[PDB]
Design a protein around this motif. Sequence first.
Motif, short mmCIF file in Angstrom:
data_model
loop_
_atom_site.label_atom_id
_atom_site.label_comp_id
_atom_site.label_asym_id
_atom_site.label_seq_id
_atom_site.Cartn_x
_atom_site.Cartn_y
_atom_site.Cartn_z
N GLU A 239 35.03 -20.13 -37.81
CA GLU A 239 34.37 -21.44 -37.80
C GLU A 239 32.85 -21.39 -37.83
OE1 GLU A 239 36.00 -23.66 -34.51
OE2 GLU A 239 38.02 -23.31 -35.30
N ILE A 240 32.24 -20.57 -36.98
CA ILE A 240 30.78 -20.47 -36.97
C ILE A 240 30.29 -19.83 -38.26
CG2 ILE A 240 30.51 -20.49 -34.44
CD1 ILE A 240 29.82 -17.40 -34.73
N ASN A 241 31.15 -19.05 -38.90
CA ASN A 241 30.84 -18.47 -40.20
C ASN A 241 30.85 -19.53 -41.29
OD1 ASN A 241 31.94 -15.43 -42.00
ND2 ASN A 241 29.95 -16.48 -41.83
N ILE A 242 31.90 -20.36 -41.32
CA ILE A 242 32.02 -21.35 -42.38
C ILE A 242 31.08 -22.58 -42.27
CG2 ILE A 242 34.42 -20.51 -42.81
CD1 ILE A 242 34.16 -24.15 -42.60
N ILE A 243 30.89 -23.10 -41.06
CA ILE A 243 30.15 -24.36 -40.86
C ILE A 243 28.74 -24.41 -41.47
CG2 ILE A 243 29.10 -25.94 -39.15
CD1 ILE A 243 31.76 -25.42 -37.49
N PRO A 244 27.86 -23.44 -41.16
CA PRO A 244 26.49 -23.44 -41.71
C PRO A 244 26.42 -23.43 -43.24
CG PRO A 244 26.63 -21.91 -39.89
CD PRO A 244 28.04 -22.30 -40.22
N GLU A 245 27.42 -22.85 -43.90
CA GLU A 245 27.47 -22.75 -45.35
C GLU A 245 27.96 -24.02 -46.02
OE1 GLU A 245 27.51 -21.39 -48.60
OE2 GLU A 245 25.81 -20.26 -47.79
N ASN A 246 28.80 -24.77 -45.30
CA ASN A 246 29.57 -25.85 -45.87
C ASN A 246 29.19 -27.23 -45.32
OD1 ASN A 246 31.84 -24.41 -47.65
ND2 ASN A 246 31.55 -23.17 -45.79
N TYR A 247 28.42 -27.24 -44.24
CA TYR A 247 27.97 -28.49 -43.65
C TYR A 247 26.46 -28.52 -43.48
CZ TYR A 247 32.90 -29.32 -42.97
OH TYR A 247 34.24 -29.48 -43.17
N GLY A 248 25.88 -29.68 -43.76
CA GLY A 248 24.48 -29.91 -43.51
C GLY A 248 24.28 -31.21 -42.76
N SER A 249 23.02 -31.52 -42.45
CA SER A 249 22.67 -32.69 -41.66
C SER A 249 21.52 -33.50 -42.26
CB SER A 249 22.29 -32.26 -40.24
OG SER A 249 21.98 -33.40 -39.45
N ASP A 250 21.52 -34.81 -42.00
CA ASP A 250 20.41 -35.68 -42.38
C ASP A 250 19.26 -35.59 -41.37
OD1 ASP A 250 21.42 -37.06 -40.19
OD2 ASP A 250 21.60 -39.00 -41.22
N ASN A 251 19.40 -34.65 -40.43
CA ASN A 251 18.46 -34.46 -39.34
C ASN A 251 18.02 -32.99 -39.25
OD1 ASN A 251 16.91 -34.89 -37.02
ND2 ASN A 251 18.68 -35.00 -35.64
N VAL A 252 18.58 -32.24 -38.29
CA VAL A 252 18.37 -30.79 -38.21
C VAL A 252 19.57 -30.07 -38.84
CG1 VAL A 252 17.74 -28.83 -36.73
CG2 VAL A 252 17.07 -31.14 -36.08
N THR A 253 19.32 -29.38 -39.94
CA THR A 253 20.36 -28.62 -40.64
C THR A 253 20.31 -27.13 -40.25
OG1 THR A 253 21.32 -28.06 -42.84
CG2 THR A 253 18.93 -28.38 -42.74
N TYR A 254 21.44 -26.60 -39.78
CA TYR A 254 21.53 -25.20 -39.43
C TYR A 254 22.04 -24.42 -40.65
CZ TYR A 254 22.05 -21.15 -36.28
OH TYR A 254 21.93 -19.92 -35.68
N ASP A 255 21.25 -23.45 -41.09
CA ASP A 255 21.51 -22.74 -42.34
C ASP A 255 22.20 -21.39 -42.11
OD1 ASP A 255 20.43 -24.63 -44.21
OD2 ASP A 255 18.41 -24.09 -43.51
N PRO A 256 22.91 -20.88 -43.13
CA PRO A 256 23.42 -19.50 -43.10
C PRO A 256 22.39 -18.47 -42.61
CG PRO A 256 24.11 -20.59 -45.13
CD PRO A 256 23.33 -21.61 -44.35
N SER A 257 21.13 -18.60 -43.06
CA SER A 257 20.06 -17.65 -42.73
C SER A 257 19.74 -17.64 -41.24
CB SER A 257 18.79 -17.94 -43.54
OG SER A 257 18.18 -19.17 -43.15
N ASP A 258 19.82 -18.81 -40.61
CA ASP A 258 19.67 -18.90 -39.16
C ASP A 258 20.77 -18.14 -38.45
OD1 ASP A 258 17.42 -20.69 -39.24
OD2 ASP A 258 18.86 -22.21 -39.90
N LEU A 259 22.00 -18.28 -38.96
CA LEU A 259 23.16 -17.58 -38.40
C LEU A 259 23.01 -16.07 -38.56
CD1 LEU A 259 25.92 -17.99 -36.93
CD2 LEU A 259 26.98 -17.76 -39.16
N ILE A 260 22.68 -15.65 -39.78
CA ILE A 260 22.42 -14.25 -40.09
C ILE A 260 21.41 -13.63 -39.12
CG2 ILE A 260 21.75 -12.56 -41.88
CD1 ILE A 260 24.37 -14.09 -42.43
N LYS A 261 20.24 -14.27 -38.98
CA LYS A 261 19.23 -13.84 -38.01
C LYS A 261 19.84 -13.68 -36.63
CE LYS A 261 15.40 -16.24 -40.46
NZ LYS A 261 15.83 -17.24 -41.47
N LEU A 262 20.53 -14.71 -36.17
CA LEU A 262 21.06 -14.76 -34.81
C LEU A 262 22.06 -13.64 -34.56
CD1 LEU A 262 22.94 -17.67 -33.08
CD2 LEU A 262 21.34 -16.07 -31.98
N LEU A 263 22.85 -13.32 -35.59
CA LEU A 263 23.92 -12.35 -35.48
C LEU A 263 23.47 -10.91 -35.71
CD1 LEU A 263 27.10 -14.00 -37.26
CD2 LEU A 263 26.59 -13.92 -34.86
N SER A 264 22.31 -10.73 -36.36
CA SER A 264 21.91 -9.39 -36.78
C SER A 264 20.66 -8.79 -36.10
CB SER A 264 21.79 -9.32 -38.32
OG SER A 264 20.66 -10.04 -38.80
#
Length: 393
Positions: A239-264
Amino acid sequence: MLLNSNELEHIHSTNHSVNDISIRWGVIGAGQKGNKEADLFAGYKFSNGTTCYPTLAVNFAESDMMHLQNIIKEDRIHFVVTDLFDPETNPNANGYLDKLAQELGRKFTNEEGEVIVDQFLICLGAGGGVGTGWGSLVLQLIREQFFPCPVSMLISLPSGDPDEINNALVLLSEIDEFMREQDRLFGNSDIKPLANVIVNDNTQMQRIIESQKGTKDLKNRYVNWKEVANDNVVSTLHEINIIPENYGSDNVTYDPSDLIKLLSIPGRFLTIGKARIAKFDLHSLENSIKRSLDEGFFSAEHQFETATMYGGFVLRPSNADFFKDVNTENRIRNTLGEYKRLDEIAGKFGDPIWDNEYAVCYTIFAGMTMPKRYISLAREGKELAEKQEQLRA
């Protein structure tokens, strides 16, 4: 396709264009318990029938892994554990590593020799003779520059056996030592060979699922709680893998790159709170988040205070006034602030919108030091060995 949770059912029912993940995991199971989790990961498919994670499962014998259902037999690789691969305490030990390398090379590589993953997700049960042996091996392999990618270790912690406890403490300590040298040598902004270690605690997970789903008196007494815990830990990760890639926001959007940073980059112990929010009021919000963190599937008396990065997102319905409300926003911030003051560390928190009527809050803390479960576990270990020798007349 595997629909391991209500969240996975909801996103795939309402979005059929889920065709990418944030990070390409190469999943490897090592113990029996690791093989279970790896088998769930192998079950995941995109909206098109394509498989999300190229995965393997590892053991010694064919008989092991006979009941795997998503990992095909070729990907079932078979050969104390860190004695077979040692060049001295075993003749032709390189024969074992070459078979490990070749099998790893064929699953995770192109025809033209290109690695098809970003990070190895390695699953194993600590405590078990096999799992702790495997975990000790992984660490050594990282030191030898064996993997062409960083590794994330997903480890479960035992309970009830003083010998399994001993094994788990030995691994955790080896992991701690490795992390210490790595954190010294690499620097805060660099990708790390050991991306993280994500800990699940058996005794913690058994408490959650056995204190629930038995609302009358009867516990059905045949449901293996582990299978229930596997579903919960693995779906959350997917789920945390799929959400950033497939969902965005009209406000604060969390991106794949943010997840990558956080995980690596943080390089240390990582935890996740998954909190579903159906009651749209401040107290229920605060409570579900705190529950997800302190008494959830990833909880292990983590040293939140020591986190170096955070991330997460509320997956919320469009046009729900509660999740456009600044009192709500401030409440999430203030609740997370009780674990680690967010002013002091990198990270962000998005509010992606999905097309469903409840919300799910995912909260992630990374680069923490030793989960204090190490301590309570050492304490129980002693108690258990005491009572083992006690009464023995």
